[model samples]
Target: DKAYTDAESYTKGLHKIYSVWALSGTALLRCWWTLQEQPTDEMKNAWNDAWCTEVNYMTWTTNKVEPIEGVYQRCMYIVALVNEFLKNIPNAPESIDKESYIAQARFNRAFAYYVLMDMFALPPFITEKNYSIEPAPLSREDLFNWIEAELNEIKPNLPSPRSEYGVADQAVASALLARMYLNAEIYTGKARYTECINACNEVIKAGYQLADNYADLFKADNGENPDTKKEIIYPIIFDGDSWGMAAIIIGARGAEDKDVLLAHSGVDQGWAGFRATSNLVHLFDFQNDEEPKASEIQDKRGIFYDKGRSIDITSSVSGTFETEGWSVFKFSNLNSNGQPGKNTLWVDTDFPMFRLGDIYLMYAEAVARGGEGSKASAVEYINALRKRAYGDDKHNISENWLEENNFRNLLDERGRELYWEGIRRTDLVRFDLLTSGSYTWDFKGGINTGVGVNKRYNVYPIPVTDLTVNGNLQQNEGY
Candidate 1:
């Protein structure tokens, strides 16, 4: 009762929700498991690249026991916290602006469910109403409907875009819905392209302008930059870092390249964890597919540090960070406005879980897929993104570009635009690239060259711990 007393009390709790557990826990799993065809397995069998192995079709060697379970437990833990908050806050005084609090909590819970639905397929459904243990596991279809309805219901109550930072608002709700609807075909086995377009329209209508520089959006001071702030819809807040998530995404380096790259990375050292596969590198029209001639690579989004790197991971031991794969230095520990973050070790740069730029890509994709959107409008939206990426219309795609492959050309566009932002696996799955023989990357299914994996690999297995305890839960097939 004392904790839920007033607006100040609620504010403290809301701020606490951005704990490291939320971003690092959720984003790390999504990034490694699905980022490129494979995130180089640095820690093997723990934060193991084995999950990457699973995608390439090799038998997963017990990664499911640790990190797979980690994602399940982490998301469920988020759900539990939000449910409790929703329950307790209902009884709070009127001064709390009940709808606003409820809107954010429900949005946060909806986000957790979205991840659960994507990663675990079906999670045990629960809400604040469920005062008892929520024993009933729900279907993907069931959860999809509920999430869409919840987002729509809360849209009006949510704050306006840019009114708050690193928080959910009307634009955030729409962006989440846009992503939800974009993947609706895979989630519900029903196409919802029009719905995706409509949701994007809502986000665009808010007029969250695009940032002039694509690289600046990922820098430390993006949170402070008015241009970037206007563009970012929702970010997972980070400060006072311990085991920083952004640290993992910034590229690893060697002694020769370390000093020069370090200046750009905004850090003294690197994580030595991840680097991009050649398959992704090929998407950029580099002079050589294997080596990124960064200056010649017209698209600024192809931000790779390729001084002494190879596109291919020749040996199976991917743990050797500096040798293979073009390290993507998209994220940095330095600030954009030429200032320092709160902590030098940690870039206080908040990770954007959803943003207007991503929403723009979604709109372009939906329209390209023959949704109820104007092709001309889709061309303009993508052109807008390309203008930011290349500083001109030279790299822009024509209206007929997406007609080449129902998904091929456009997905490459998305891959080029949004790679390593934790959207790859889903985008690949949505495009029938993941677990499909038609598309393969290096080390997919443990083959030197990529191969198709079974569709069963699409949904992760329910955790054994949860499955053993809950009679209501069912394990996904092919586990």
Candidate 2:
């Protein structure tokens, strides 16, 4: 009876903890997506209207960017919840393995901190022991070091990949570490491309394989599909009836009522907000003008719903018609069995937070960044993803092109493969394209045709609330 009660309590705690994670994760994705060149018009307008501080992010107006209190508070709440879970785990029955629960709690804390580090550069450092006290901020370098140490210490306790879905495992930690290392120069002013390659290699050795069908990884039944299960390293699990915030957020964006896009998605209606920009569409490098040619069509990852949609964005204001932009049809609420989801109001498609496809790209990118990996190996890795996308090897790139190690080509390839996945802004910043006059997209830097903005927009302002309330917090420069 005690064991059952302990298990029930622990499970309930995890459910509540994950609810917080889902909300914050979705918010982070939405926050960063607005600053990128992906979403335009209504979505961009909504962000400017609602998150005015973030508009400064779009326009590089530091003084206009106010403190984003809500984002800071949400991140703080995640830390508190994880600490609470850790506090209770020791009280559980003897039959329960407290170490595993502790490890999970630590991973959750690290994940939250990782998000904080990525966005804020330096956030107030807190842990289970010092969470009650008002904490001082860590330097970006120190924070990165701390996160690395915590993940390394706790990784041994995490379960193997695929052992449990929606749970942090060794592979998930490795992926996060790889991501951190890949962006280390930005965070700590030191390049760790070699470390990034090593971390990615760890994940690759964990027995993860690409799903036979690329589209299967995003279907409604992805949570239960065996093929997808092998590819998804860590997922943000969502269900229509129970946990569905992730679905509602993504599904509620883009498309029009009369359009078949929403109908095909099994959603009742479109939110009429958030649509892709020409910058993203052109990344596919489609051969034909209107749509992809027969050869271009082989790359199935560039899926779109363009029946009555335009590539040109007409407005950046809400309540505008949806036909102004192309709608994304990549994610759907249809099960692998070709049946609709359990509920149309919400979707059951799980968001892949970390996957084998991303790992392949990471390995290739690290190698291109002058890491230890060879060009031959990087070509093979990228070709694996191409083979799945094309359903064959016909579209694979040559080893000579891979040897060129062009960051521009890799960035475009990443965009083609990972568009609308909420990582564009970071990728652009890393490649010096986000604020560079060299690359321009519609409505970039708050202009109709895109213009260069100050480099200070790279890191967001420390929420004004934090600066006001916490004396220890220092704002990022130019904000």
Question: Per-prediction TM-score, please?
Answer: 0.90, 0.88
lDDT of 1 at 97: 80
In terms of TM-score, how similar is model 2 to the real structure? 0.88
- What digit string (tens of lDDT, one per residue) describes model 2 on residues 1-479? 11225677787676666656455433533444444433222223323354542452265333433223444566677787787777778788786678877787788788778777876777888877776355888898999999899899999998877688888888999999998898888888998989999999999899998888788788888989999998988887777774233433344355446345445675666665455566666666465757643235546787666656566554653344355555566777877777777877567888787787877887888887788887788899889888877677787886565536447777877787776665666777777777777887766666657777777777667776567777877888766
TM-score for model 1?
0.90
- What is the alpha-carbon lDDT for the whole of candidate 2? 0.69
Find the 10 residues in a row with the least total lDDT in model 2: 38-47
Q: Which stretches of candidate 2 lie over 4 Å from their true place?
A: 1-7, 23-57, 60-70, 242-262, 289-298, 314-321, 403-406
| Cα-based lDDT for every prediction | 0.70, 0.69
Over 420-478, each residue of candidate 1 has an lDDT whose tens digit, in order, gives 67777788778876777777766665676756666777767777778777888787777
Model 2 CA lDDT for position 34: 44
| Candidate 1 residue pairs in backbone clash | 56-444, 56-445, 57-445
